[PDB]
């Protein structure tokens, strides 16, 4: 199933080079799927225990989701433009409660793209979901008794049998390997939960990013121009900041080997803005407010 | 069947580099078919259950169709030019009810190219359709009884046989693997449904895109010039918007390190227009209406 | 498990080329993981002794952590800017007690990135943690008696058996290889401790580097400009120092084959500074204080 | 450019400050604080 999902990686590399909502993290998601298909070639360590099988399945599922959710927050620039130095903002430059929640849900969804994709990848594998209800099916309270004292584990594996003892309640190696009828049943149960999660996330994400492209105040040419102007001023401003710091570092380095902007400007110079005026991306709005009235 | 359909992918790469209706998504469709032939090299997980086999077949068929239909909507530009910010259009700039349905059916067909192609690819495989009426043939109500309690599954697989028990009503492994006579019969049943769907879609699509190239008001040289002018102004306008935002970001970045267009224009600047006048693609029609009378 | 974690190395090479806190050591960490996956292909020497198994496991875990912690200190520049020549600083140029602890915790966390990653890599292997409680499970006080005199080791391996003698308290080869039920149990115990450590470190590191990006005085554009100015003056100052020493070495080399700056400046020229004034990175603050008043 | 800028942009000035020729003095007073 590795080369199949790698071909799917090439397909959605073509997708994340075509379009989407944004594309700041489309490089990393396809590399995660294309590398962790080959990880899933060597997985399901899948212990033979009552609590540790649920732990090794539940942690291994809902752990990298939280990890990639945290990475999708922290790498995403806009949340830092919301909350880089939230304590020491000069007052009334932090903007609102309603708009900051819209930006918060924006960065949450742009973050949560990648963990939903990873969850769909592993649920789409016949993997750690069989390692979950392979436990939860096996009637395992006698293996609680078997692991109260490991002498019972030894004499349940060796003296009494394992699959001949499939009558009552079971001790371990049903856990690490089930019946292949049960294994295939629960494997495709994982496949249908995988596609149900993917289709639910796709429909809900389509509906949300449509309802924030259909309730958008600006319209499609005006929105493409605001996005082009945003994407050019947050590069041209950085190029001018770099050459300004480079000249003032040139002169201050020459200043040493020849011996022998208030917070209001640096805070109106920061986005997560209102889009209610003809000017926007509040470098413009600061510039209209204070000096240098027009360019 | 993988390299065969990959050769078909190369053939229809030549086709989608020759002609068609449009070619904005012809790159991705051939990559989907050429990668998911190799996906179909490793498929039919195909569970041994009464409801889950129909679920794992029906979801796996009609799920990626809806997913690629949603992708074919959202990637396609024209529907956003219909409905990017449909709430906050300045009134009477949204145009009609009849013309917007023509554009809606246009983006629906240009979307639905790729799911019909994917449906034909998987039906053309002997795949998840055998995984559908392999269930629906097998007389499976005794497997409902077998999966009311999995002890009956165990003693139907082990104690009683599976293919020696082909007399009455069946319990699982008929489901996961049928008789090869039945399998080949139902496989080519899937092949003839595949080609029936493809030929029906091809005839209907030919008839529709002919009846919207034969009921077209403009004629073939005038239509090729309107398409060339559209395809050059929605690139030249973006180049001028980029260099305009670049100059006004240059000057506004220099404006900060030296301290120490109403909605009517941005809405008549948007397509999904009437083609009833000598001017068209309503940047021209706006320009004829308001200032800068001729170029 | 080698190529899997090498694919993870490629993924987090993409991560450490995207973003983070800093990236001065992101080259070396991925090379450590990608090379020591292939080291872990040939590991668990794992002796058959009572004290030496715990020693060979505990030293091999908590040794390279201390080694990479020491390397992460010494390679990191900022701690030397705190304490290169701490004895012979001219007095009141060493700054405070509170701020130097903030820089100390900064260099401790930037150091401790790599040992936590290495600890997670080896705990994520089924490795030297099975080589720890494979000892601690095996009831080994009879192997203390067996290694009080190695004649008992010889007659415990040869005359009496090893796995037939799994009744009471055990002598060696249980240690070097346990029961595979126990081995897989304790292996996935190591996996869940691995992910628990990784998730705890990730949540705590996110919370700390957020609480020192949310309690930051400057804000995100001002902080990016201070970081750009810092990253350009500690290169432009070095280029001017190099060409100044090159001219004064040119002239002093010509000065020999033609025969036949107090400590205050060199100490205010050093960082780990206060960020309380409009000027910062105290080359600027020195320059404002003493001569060459402005550039 | 209001009349205040076009009037502090005009000489016959005081020479009492470190800046002079009152384009400089206007520039120090109002925006564009230093060159």
Backbone break loci in chain C, preceding residues, C–N > 2.5 A: 260
Query: What is the Cα–Cα distance from A217 to A200, expressed in whole angstroms?
Result: 28
Query: What is the Cα–Cα distance from A130 to B120, expressed in whole angstroms?
Result: 32
Query: What is the Cα–Cα distance from C171 to C163, expressed in whole angstroms?
Result: 10
Question: Which chains have at least 3 CB atom pairs separated by less than 8 Å from chain B?
Answer: A, D
* Terminal-residue alpha carbon distance, chain C: 58
Query: What is the Cα–Cα distance from A284 to C121, expressed in whole angstroms?
Result: 48
Chain A residues with CB under 8 Å of D30 CB are 291
Tokens of C59: 């030293």
Query: What is the Cα–Cα distance from C77 to B199, expressed in whole angstroms?
Result: 70
Say how many CA atoms lie within 13 Å of A107 toward its Cβ. 20
Please tell me what resolution, in angstroms, this structure has. Answer: 3.7
Which of C4, C215, C283 is opposite residue A42, by nearest beta carbon? C4
Query: Distance from B115 to chain A by nearest Cα, in Å?
Result: 14
Query: What is the Cα–Cα distance from C84 to C267, expressed in whole angstroms?
Result: 11
Beta-carbon contacts below 8 Å between A and C: 190
A64 in Cβ contact with A115 (< 8 Å) = yes
- Residue A287: closest C-alpha in chain D: D31
Query: What is the Cα–Cα distance from C283 to C269, expressed in whole angstroms?
Result: 5
Tokens of C7: 């694919």
A152 in Cβ contact with A50 (< 8 Å) = no
C191 in Cβ contact with A45 (< 8 Å) = yes
Query: Distance from B91 to chain D by nearest Cα, in Å?
Result: 39
Beta-carbon contacts below 8 Å between B and D: 6
Distance from the Cα of residue C36 to its chain's centroid: 15
Q: How many CB atoms lie within 10 A of CB A284?
A: 20
Query: What is the Cα–Cα distance from B267 to B283, expressed in whole angstroms?
Result: 10
Q: Across the interface, do A295 and B241 touch by the CB < 8 Å criterion?
A: no
Of C40, B35, C7, nearest in space to A37 by CA: C7
Q: Alpha-carbon dihedral of residues C83, C87, C88, C89, nearest 10 degrees?
A: 50
Query: What is the Cα–Cα distance from C237 to D30, expressed in whole angstroms?
Result: 34
A249 in Cβ contact with C229 (< 8 Å) = yes
Residue listed under structure tokens 């601690």: C136
A280: contact with B, CB 8 A cutoff = no
Q: Across the interface, do A232 and B242 touch by the CB < 8 Å criterion?
A: yes
A105: contact with C, CB 8 A cutoff = no
Tokens of A206: 């389509």
- Residue B259: closest C-alpha in chain D: D32
Query: What is the Cα–Cα distance from A214 to B84, expressed in whole angstroms?
Result: 5
Q: Name residues whose C-beta falls within 8 Å of residue C53's C-beta, 6 or more positions apart in sequence.
A: C46, C47, C131, C132, C134, C135, C175
Interface test with C, best of A78, A170, A252 (most C CBs within 10 A): A252
A133 in Cβ contact with A193 (< 8 Å) = no
B259: contact with D, CB 8 A cutoff = yes
Tokens of A33: 């799927």
Distance from the Cα of residue C122 to its chain's centroid: 14
Kindly calculate the radius of gyration of chain B based on its CA atoms and give it in whole angstroms: 28
B58: contact with A, CB 8 A cutoff = no
Question: According to the entry, how was the structure determined?
Answer: cryo-EM
Tokens of A182: 């049960």
B258: contact with D, CB 8 A cutoff = yes
Output the DSSP codes for B2-41: HHHHHHHHHHHHHHHHH-SS--SSHHHHHHHHHHHHHHHT
Look at residue B70 and give its three-state secondary structure.
Answer: helix
Residue B117 phi, psi dihedral angles, 5° rounding: -65, -40
D4: contact with A, CB 8 A cutoff = no
Tokens of C133: 């409680």
A84: contact with B, CB 8 A cutoff = no
Interface test with B, best of A133, A188, A269 (most B CBs within 10 A): A188
Residue C47 phi, psi dihedral angles, 5° rounding: -65, 165
Query: What is the Cα–Cα distance from B63 to B56, expressed in whole angstroms?
Result: 10
B281: contact with A, CB 8 A cutoff = no
Query: What is the Cα–Cα distance from A171 to A49, expressed in whole angstroms?
Result: 9
Q: How many CB atoms lie within 10 A of CB B137?
A: 17
Which of A1, A18, A219 is opposite residue B84, by nearest beta carbon? A219
A139: left (phi over 0), alpha (psi -120 to 50) or beta: left
Q: Across the interface, do A295 and B251 touch by the CB < 8 Å criterion?
A: yes
D30: contact with B, CB 8 A cutoff = no
DSSP C89: P
Q: Classify the C-alpha dihedral A213-A214-A218-A221 as positive or negative.
A: positive
C11 in Cβ contact with A32 (< 8 Å) = yes
Tokens of A289: 């407010």
Query: Distance from A278 to chain C by nearest Cα, in Å?
Result: 23
B41 in Cβ contact with A10 (< 8 Å) = no
Q: Across the interface, do D31 and B260 touch by the CB < 8 Å criterion?
A: no
Query: What is the Cα–Cα distance from A163 to A171, expressed in whole angstroms?
Result: 10
B152: contact with A, CB 8 A cutoff = no
B16 in Cβ contact with B26 (< 8 Å) = yes
Chain D residues with CB under 8 Å of B258 CB are 32
Query: What is the Cα–Cα distance from C161 to A67, expressed in whole angstroms?
Result: 48
Query: What is the Cα–Cα distance from C189 to C177, expressed in whole angstroms?
Result: 17
CA dist C263 → A251, B6, C206, C233, C274 (Å): 22, 74, 40, 20, 20
Q: Classify the C-alpha dihedral A85-A86-A87-A93 as positive or negative.
A: positive
């Amino acid at each position: 199933m590795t080369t199949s999902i790698n071909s799917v990686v090439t397909v959605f590399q073509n997708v994340f080079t075509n379009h989407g909502s944004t594309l700041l993290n489309g490089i990393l998601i396809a590399t995660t799927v294309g590398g962790q298909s080959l990880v899933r070639k060597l997985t399901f360590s899948c212990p033979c225990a009552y609590p540790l099988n649920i732990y090794h399945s539940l942690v291994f599922m809902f752990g990298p989701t939280a990890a990639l959710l945290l990475i999708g927050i922290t790498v995403n620039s806009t949340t830092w433009k919301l909350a880089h130095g939230f304590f020491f903002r000069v007052r009334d430059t932090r903007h609102s409660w309603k708009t900051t929640c819209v930006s918060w849900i924006e960065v949450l969804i742009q973050s949560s793209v990648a963990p939903i994709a990873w969850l769909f990848v592993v649920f789409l594998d016949g993997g750690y979901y069989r390692c979950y209800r392979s436990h939860e099916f096996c009637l395992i309270s006698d293996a609680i008794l078997c692991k109260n004292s490991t002498i019972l584990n030894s004499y349940a594996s060796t003296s009494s049998f394992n699959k001949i003892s499939d009558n009552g309640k079971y001790c371990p190696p049903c856990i690490c390997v089930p019946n292949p009828t049960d294994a295939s049943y629960l494997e495709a149960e994982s496949q249908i939960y995988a596609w149900g999660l993917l289709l639910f996330s796709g429909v809900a994400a389509f509906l949300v990013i449509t309802c924030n492209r259909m309730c958008d105040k600006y319209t499609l040419v005006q929105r493409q121009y605001v996005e082009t102007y945003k994407n050019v001023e947050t590069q041209k401003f950085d190029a001018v900041a770099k050459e300004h710091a480079s000249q003032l570092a040139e002169h201050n380095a020459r200043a040493f080997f020849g011996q022998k902007n208030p917070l209001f400007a640096r805070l109106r110079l920061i986005a997560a803005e209102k889009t209610q005026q003809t000017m926007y991306t509040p470098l413009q709005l600061w510039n209209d407010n204070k000096g240098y009235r027009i360019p």
